[PDB]
Symmetry: D4
Subunit: 200 residues, 8 copies
């Protein structure tokens, strides 16, 4: 919970809102969390086309300059780091616990957009998407929860009953929104993502 | 529950509904509840620009003239009192119990608008907003429940399992409404609010 | 459950759908249930301006001619009876059990409109409306459940966990509909209604 | 012919139960009408329904006049009225009916928006015609549609052609609603049948 | 779960989307599952007017040519088979367990449209539709669950707590969709359907 | 050319299962059509689909006539009909086709609104044209759009220019719907291709 | 009279609590206004409400000018302004008012869309007139409606007739909204009453 | 100038993750454009974004031509294209630009609706003008709005005045959408600035 940081970046809108005007851009909010090895997880869709991403811890007002290590394209995950060491001082990385089951309560921790306070959201795993290799083995690919993740929270951690992390959280964009539906990327995807980065 | 009073005031609409007509105004309903020390809590947004606010207890038809002690601007809380002593006769102030947790059942008691009957609404704490001081300490700032608070109920008390009060209740105004989403101001905010009043 | 009958009547629409055309009318469906003393409960809003209301039991295709004893105006309740004795043969009236509490599961049994099959709907008591006399005593006035009652079901019985009746059920008309919100008239209202009839 | 247009007041009781345990909600409504030849006033049937008494108001004063309901249509939404007070009729030229309108004719609709005492004048053009046919090949105008939304209180007011002559009674579409820009007018042949069926 | 297959067919739209253009058609997705006796269950509405339906198992990319045995008209059920024996090799048909009760958790397994991954959806039986013969006996006719079945999933199996099948699943088409409402055809209907086929 | 416009009756069975355990809902529908040269009637393809028999009604009488389906379009929503009864054709002048219309042309659409036997006449103007091109640079009118909503029952009726000559078949937009004020017309070249492809 | 049209800047604080535990949200808003005779500027009352100071901008430069609030209407949404800086008034011809407009008159509305500094010019026609009546039979224009949507920032800007003379102040409909194509204009008599009531 | 209007093909990858664990969805899109002087084609910037290659199609044939992206606007949604194939340009007269349009001018928009190869021609009138101002009092046309909805595939196509001369590039409103009947056109001055900034 002290590992949950707020992400600041500049969001350039995808569309011309009027054909005779430059694309509207403005500063946006997002969430992330500290994992082991001086790394911060967050979503990709908030650090794309970035010029500079700045982080912020809970009690402090001090912003820090993050360094984009990798930006996923197969999944909405970004891997960051910070050069300053004052950032990593006195903060405990999250721990990754057991994969949740259907109807399991999850908790999503993030910073709602336009503020510095932390929001904690309760949700239950209402749907799972499951990968299936030709080997015969199946890994967990997607989680859906029955609670809406408000805008700024996207990219924060999702915890199980035991305060252990079970993935990254995402506001439901497609279809209709704010209708009590959220998404979560399970740990195996996060693993593969880091694996593909470290190895290559 | 016998501490829950109905609030009568005059609500002047925020907008001209037609640019050539005076702002539409009419009498409105709201809810509140008796706390210790001859004080009544309710929301601010029902007593702003007031000329006179009148209260009413459950079984009686008698209205009483309330006296606005303070109107919050940092939070939607108003502090009232009544000079008549017949008001405070034979009524027990609510008791403030333990802060609720996620998924905790809460109960919201208020008077629905346009009637004298009491409505009791069941809801569960679906989200929490948490303050964080530079000291390192965190206090509870906001509660969201998974049940809609209908109009007149706003300002009434919210109780935990043990019939103990855990805050003031509010109809969700912003975003979409009546979609099973309500707000509750936790006790620490109410405390700070009274503290800022008494001390100053 | 064998006490739950289907109600047939002619519904004349409230509005001219075109100002130059007679009011549109057509046959409608509704639900009711057998209580003690050769009486059938149902809603008022399906037997208003009636010419003739016809009932029907579960397994039989035979319709029976009902006789409107009373039509409520303070509450949406109608009291019927049937002169034929073949109707009351081999059918057990419902039994009225304890008043439900918040979050109590209820079951609503009725005939969905346009068919002869029975629908059974699960819902939980999500809200209560409470009367308060000047004496100091409070009786239960209204129940709201977190499940939608589809059209034809209105007027059927609502049961508690123990298969005992706890009131009459109603499709939510006002505000928005089919958004998982139903109403139920508690037993004390049904009692008062019958009392006001028998005594007068 | 501004002076012939009057505001209709009647107590409207809703067709539905707002809640199954309460009386049908009931409140004062507003509507329009107009003075014709022979001490008569035309307005809509729907506003004067029930056996509530109806009041009339004229353009200049706030004086209300008690009206007598002569006939309430059922084949069409027209009601015929009169007023005993001789001062009601004094110094008012009744409307004069004109030629049947054709497609694309410009019309003008005069009435009192609900809630206010001021007169409204809405432009519109005949967008659709409904036409009745007889067993010998004769044709009669049954309905008119205009490409203008008629606001609630205006129903019952007159519709005029370019030459200021009345050409039917104006009505709002009850479904659809509202800014679909559709409006209905009952043409004179129907009004004539209504009155002939009254007199005979 | 290894018995759950993906269904490929060509869906010809029901309407001309423009009156001067041929009806729009395109390839669609659907779900089904293997039962005993070299048979595959699925919905009818995906194999109507078919030219050829092709199946696919979980880990394999190999498609197989299915053979439409029967297409229901009383219920949305299709009965398929495959001539290839490599299809039925090493796959265990589902087992049919006890009929669920109200509030019973069910699980729906299917392939979401436009992908090969398996989706697993949690839902609870929120409503039952019950048949009633003149004999006096009642069989279960319909199940409704409080979770939406996304498009491609329709036709897959629904399981109870014990991983035993309790019917075929269906996306809610009528009324509003994706509002957390799904349908399931209970086992007795599936039985009757197969009975009517085998016997005739 | 009012006399040439006829009302089409056909039993319409819906394309979807209303509930997966019931027969597809099925009910009588209404539509429009019109008499042309050579003992033929034009109407839409969608109303006469399935092998249901279709009846026709004329403007004056309530007599229905059994129709014969000669050809049902697939490249366009047109059907060609005829009637054996000689009395159907007696004393009716068929429609006469006119010049290709241009953008901003005023058109008139004649038909029978669903549910009634009276004739409707809707104004409209050509707002958009869809144009086909050939491998040599030739152009042909493919579709017309008008800025008027065509109500359901009117589909199949004729569209006329200022000079009263037919200029295509009228259709309602199935999506969008409804008061978007958009309407479709199939122009004469397409009708001509449909008939030439019939005869040849 | 482009040069007389100015952009109004004011800090707008919302009428509602976004969340009950936060300050009412507050942000800079934009609006329009225009220069009239006698060192005065007309704009709307709603933008300049609260005791926030208001700035003005002219067509060519980005220079803002501090404005003085002379009078804020309550019977109508009009505010009268002035600016001390003499350079504000230099080289600007104030608007000239013209004849009362009639139904179907073409009007033109000039203003600054919110968020930008460029001038917008919207076409429209008078679709409805609201008319006031006196106790002696006199009539005065009270309100105008146009069949064009006025975008947010344009409220307060001028409305012109065919001859370029001002004919009222333009306003957007706050409910309905937005592409209902409805717009409001306060006609000159009301403006005149506002100013006479100011001076006197 | 039908022959100058071409259909643009480009592979469009969406700006959002459909699901956080999948690649951003990606599919072939369609758009319009037109041939101008000097071996150039104008179309919109948004369709040709990313470094996907773009193909062009002409009115008569289904032949596609590989296009070269010369310049993609950022201050406006315009892209400048060319094609190496000499046969693309053969026998095609480029569009000719005409006078700046005024309010209420009739315009015509030519383009290819998405999904099809046929040409669409939409009527419309200039409903609003956005006007830029310079630090000395000069004015330039910045944007045009028309009272016609431009369907998706038409964006990039030309807009013509009564005299058939081009008068800007047509665009659909991305929000609002769709039958609000609003359409955008970038007028020639902006196109001219785009090209001058290209050449220089």
């Amino acid at each position: 919970m002290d590992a949950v940081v707020k992400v600041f970046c500049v969001h350039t809108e995808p569309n011309f809102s009027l054909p005779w005007q430059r694309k509207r851009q403005y500063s946006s909010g997002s969430s992330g969390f500290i994992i082991g090895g001086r790394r911060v997880l967050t979503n990709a869709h908030s650090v794309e086309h970035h010029t500079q991403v700045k982080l912020k811890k809970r009690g402090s007002d001090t912003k820090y300059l993050a360094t984009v290590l990798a930006i996923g394209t197969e999944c909405d995950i970004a891997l960051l780091t910070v050069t300053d060491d004052e950032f990593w001082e006195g903060v405990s990385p999250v721990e990754f616990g057991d994969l949740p089951a259907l109807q399991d309560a999850v908790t999503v921790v993030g910073y709602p957009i336009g503020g510095d306070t932390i929001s904690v959201t309760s949700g239950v795993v209402s749907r799972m998407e499951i990968l299936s290799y030709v080997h015969g083995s199946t890994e967990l690919l997607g989680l859906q929860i029955d609670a809406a993740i408000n805008s700024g929270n996207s990219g924060g951690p999702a915890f199980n009953d035991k305060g252990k992390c079970v993935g990254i959280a995402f506001q439901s964009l497609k279809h209709e929104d704010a209708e009590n539906i959220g998404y979560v990327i399970p740990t195996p995807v996060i693993v593969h993502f880091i694996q593909d980065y470290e190895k290559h």
